[PDB]
Design a protein around this nucleic acid. Structure first.
Length: 178
RNA sequence: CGCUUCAGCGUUCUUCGGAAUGUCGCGCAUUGGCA
């Protein structure tokens, strides 16, 4: 599916989600498909956990992870070899962030569609509200919290927090999204 | 038999241009970088 999700992104980025419509065509078809695919998996996991009333109940979790001391780590250079270190240290933090995201999605059995957006040193993911997914976050955070301690003794850290959000919250009904 | 008046006067007193220019405006070695 990962190759398919890349395939959609390359072609459907220019395509608008809705055409010849009064509302703004500010959403791409790939974005519309990606959000639908991510939400569909989230709903399925909740149902496996076991319309208008469906929106009211809390079916999704808002989960974000942020690295700590990323800017301190980049300039940790002695300066004996600073030009190469600065480039690679930033790259390592960027790729290590992707590795953490991929590891979390693999445990939850979710595609890259669930990663709604990323910022340097940060990840923004949409996950099902199922208690099984909540258990994984406890396991995943504890695993990566110990791994960073093993490798970087307080030089780097990650924290994960999850907030339960209902279906209407995603639609931004009553301004609850922001 | 000389005597006297006059003893210099009026008028230019410097002028017109150039008023600095061109060249260099830190370099090297160590630090860095690359191997």
């Amino acid at each position: 599916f990962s190759s398919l999700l890349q395939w959609t992104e390359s072609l459907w980025s220019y395509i608008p989600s809705s055409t010849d419509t009064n509302q703004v065509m500010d959403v791409s078809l790939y974005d519309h498909s990606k959000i639908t695919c991510a939400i569909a998996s989230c709903i399925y996991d909740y149902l496996t956990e076991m319309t208008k009333q469906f929106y009211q109940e809390d079916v999704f979790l808002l989960v974000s992870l942020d690295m700590s001391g990323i800017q301190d780590f980049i300039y940790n250079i002695s300066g004996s070899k600073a030009l190469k270190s600065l480039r690679s240290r930033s790259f390592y933090l960027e790729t290590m962030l992707e590795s953490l995201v991929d590891d979390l999605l693999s445990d939850l059995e979710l595609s890259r569609a669930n990663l709604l957006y990323t910022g340097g040193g940060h990840a923004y993911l949409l996950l099902p509200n199922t208690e099984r997914a909540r258990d994984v976050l406890a396991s995943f955070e504890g695993e990566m919290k110990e791994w960073f301690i093993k490798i970087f003794k307080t030089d780097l850290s990650v924290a994960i927090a999850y907030k339960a959000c209902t279906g209407e919250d995603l639609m931004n009904s009553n301004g609850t999204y922001s």
